[PDB]
Amino acid sequence: IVKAGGKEQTFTADKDVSIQPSPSFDEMNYQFNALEIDGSGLNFINNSA
Amino acid sequence: IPPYNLSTHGDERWFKLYIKHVVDNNSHIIYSGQLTDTNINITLFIPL
């Protein structure tokens, strides 16, 4: 879930992760493809967003 | 590494990982350990 000032975006593993990790309870690592976020929309307060 | 099953692995919990076709065609040990009841999560650096 991405909160970017006035923008809101979500990404989901079943569209964004090309390789499904194995099921062990020990550790499931989901590696996402680059997620494009709308930086425009950010509030640069004191020049910082 | 999948969890240990005597019927598929043998009476020993022994196992090792080896590397080949980097530098030479010899089999070199890169990891050793025991086979556990749960899966074993091992991270290695493989040189090229």
| Structure resolution, Å | 3.7
Q: Distance from B28 to chain A by nearest Cα, in Å?
A: 27
Q: Which chain B residues touch A26 with a CB distance below 8 Å?
A: 38-39, 41
Amino acid at A16: D
B41 neighbors A22 (Cβ within 8 angstroms):
no
- Of B20, B8, B14, nearest to B47 by C-alpha is B20
CA distances from A35 to A5, A31, A40, A48 (A): 17, 11, 15, 22
Secondary structure element (H or E) that encloses residue B7, with its range: helix B6-9
Q: Which residues of B touch A (CB under 8 A)?
A: 38-39, 41
From which experimental method does this structure derive? cryo-EM
Q: Distance from A29 to chain B by nearest Cα, in Å?
A: 12
